[PDB]
Amino acid sequence: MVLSEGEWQLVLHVWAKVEADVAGHGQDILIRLFKSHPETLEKFDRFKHLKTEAEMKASEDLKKAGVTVLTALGAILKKKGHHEAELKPLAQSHATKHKIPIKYLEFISEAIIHVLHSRHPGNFGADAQGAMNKALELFRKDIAAKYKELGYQG
Numbered sequence: 001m002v003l004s005e006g007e008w009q010l011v012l013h014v015w016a017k018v019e020a021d022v023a024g025h026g027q028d029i030l031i032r033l034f035k036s037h038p039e040t041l042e043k044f045d046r047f048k049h050l051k052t053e054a055e056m057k058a059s060e061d062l063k064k065a066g067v068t069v070l071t072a073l074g075a076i077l078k079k080k081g082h083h084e085a086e087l088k089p090l091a092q093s094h095a096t097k098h099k100i101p102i103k104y105l106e107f108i109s110e111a112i113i114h115v116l117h118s119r120h121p122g123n124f125g126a127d128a129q130g131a132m133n134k135a136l137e138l139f140r141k142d143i144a145a146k147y148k149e150l151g152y153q154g
């Protein structure tokens, strides 16, 4: 699939807002993911023991993980589709080391959309959300293809 320049502009416009507070968006997104799909928390051995949202909000390890997720995703989005190089090591670690099914990438994609919708209603209208969804679908499609080449595709 291919996004138009206009769609990339909508994506990068709201992303510039996200970058004003990377750590805060990172926390919100991961907490949303864990509350909606608790099974996903089990993959993070470092903080798999957190029981409540209050504990999650207080965790420095979870905040750092959120910053890591957003910084990596931001680098990918700014490539505007020319992200083959950035995707290789990411697909390898998530398929082979962490063992993250595509299903979970769909779950985090939904958490990202929910948080942007909550925090940036003025810059995340229907057209902007459609463009962000398309960009994340492109990301998931290319990652799924790499998973298969690596012997996982789970």
Ligand code: HEM
Pocket: 040, 041, 043, 044, 045, 046, 068, 069, 070, 072, 073, 089, 090, 093, 094, 098, 100, 104, 105, 108
């Ligand atoms: C947009 C989605 C994602 C991005 C861009 C991303 C990015 C990263 C990055 C850059 C790291 C650091 C080095 C490495 O590759 O190991 C990492 C680690 C990890 N990721 Fe992801 N990730 C994503 C989604 C997920 C999901 C959905 C899960 C689990 C449900 C997950 C679980 C992990 C785990 C377990 C680690 C290592 C934690 C640690 O450092 O101890 N990732 N991810």
